[PDB]
């Protein structure tokens, strides 16, 4: 919570599109007590859209990677499980962060669907992945 | 128009899925206003449809509700790129689970085209639309046979 508010201020000048997604998670946490099941579902949506936003930025930071049909199977290979040699350093960190958010959102979805008891602990594990991935993205963009 | 015929039939077989199909229709009629926003809406709606199909799978297979640890690993294998459909599910459960993977794989593919600057979003959206329509038909039919 306190770490996300700090990251949203940094992203407001570094990557305001991602900063608005951090503010979305802060809103979901702020209204968590009203409905924790809706907060978990909202967190799954935001982390998926955050992972999609990260992949989009990787292709933007590597414009020459955009034959479009060739890129299709390449984005799918970069969202699961090597990295192309021409991919910029910032593109590597942001692509890895997108994978971590996707796996965390999928695991959180599986815990919610199966009726896992400790849903709050399951959401805290996904929040910890979202915080750590946003930190690595903010650091790579600063050195870029 | 195919979705309109499906939305009518879904309002009896499964109203929740018909609601999501109606959201896809609205994203198509308003596609002229903002194609980029229409594609991003179709991606999230197809993913929501896949989350709805998986919930119905567990509802139709209540034996999995007894062990949340094994079922959580089962759903996580469905959401992943592996997409290993278990063979012990019910007939409707297997069909809906495969349709959930097909919707998610088509949603990721449409995202890949959008992030790649395909510029031909109508062709890309029509391809993901074809997977969505065929998956919805298999789900509506499977639930119709299950209710008899």
- Residue pair B39/B110 in contact by the 8 Å Cβ criterion: yes
Rounded-to-integer distance, Cα B121 and Cα A93, Å: 28
Which chain A residues contact residue B75 at CB under 8 A?
109-110, 113-114
Measured in whole angstroms, the distance separating CA B35 from the mean position of its chain's CA atoms is 21
What are the extents of the domains in chain A? 2-143
Which tokens in the block code for residue A143? 């050195």
Q: Which residue of A has its CA nearest to B63?
A: A114
Which chain B residues contact residue A56 at CB under 8 A?
114-115
A64 interfaces chain B, CB cutoff of 8 Å: no
Neighbouring CB atoms inside 10 A of B41's CB total 18
Rounded-to-integer distance, Cα A103 and Cα A118, Å: 19
Q: Is B19 exposed, middle or buried (0-12, 13-18, 19+ CB in 10 A)?
A: middle
What is the maximal distance between C-alpha atoms in chain A?
48
A window 74-93, beta carbon within 8 A of B = 75-76, 79-81
Q: Going by C-beta distance under 8 Å and a sequence separation of 6 or more, which residues neighbour residue A44? A: A105, A108, A109, A112, A126, B51
DSSP sequence for A59-116? HHHSGGG--HHHHHHHHHHHS-----TT--HHHHHHHHHHHHHHHHHHHHHHHHHTT-
Rounded-to-integer distance, Cα A76 and Cα B105, Å: 9
Q: How many residues does chain A have?
A: 144
Contact: A114, B55; criterion CB under 8 Å: no
The residue among B49, B55, B63, B75 with the most chain A CBs within 10 A of its CB, best to mutate, is: B75
Single out the residue of B127, B116, B46 nearest to residue A60, CA to CA.
B116
* Residue A98 C-alpha, separation from nearest chain B C-alpha, in angstroms: 13
> Residue B108: which of A79, A107, A110 has the nearest Cβ?
A79
Rounded-to-integer distance, Cα A34 and Cα A117, Å: 18
Angle CA(A79)–CA(A84)–CA(A90) in degrees, nearest 5? 75
Rounded-to-integer distance, Cα A118 and Cα A126, Å: 13
User: Which is it for the CA torsion B3, B8, B10, B13, positive or negative?
Assistant: negative
- DSSP letter at A129 equals H
Which tokens in the block code for residue A4? 């996300």
């Amino acid at each position: 919570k306190e770490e996300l508010e700090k990251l949203a201020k940094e992203l407001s000048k570094v990557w305001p599109e991602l900063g608005k997604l951090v503010e979305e998670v802060i809103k979901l946490i702020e209204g968590r007590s009203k409905d924790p099941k809706a907060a978990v579902e909202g967190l799954i949506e935001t982390m998926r859209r955050a992972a999609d936003l990260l992949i989009e930025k990787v292709l933007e930071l590597n414009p020459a990677l955009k034959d479009p049909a060739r890129t299709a199977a390449l984005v799918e290979r970069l969202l699961a499980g090597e990295i192309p040699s021409f991919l910029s350093e910032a593109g590597r960190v942001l692509a890895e962060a997108a994978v971590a958010m996707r796996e965390a959102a999928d695991r959180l979805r599986a815990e919610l669907a199966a009726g896992n008891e400790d849903l709050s602990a399951a959401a805290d594990e996904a929040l910890a992945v979202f915080v750590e991935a946003v930190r690595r993205v903010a650091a790579a963009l600063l050195e870029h």
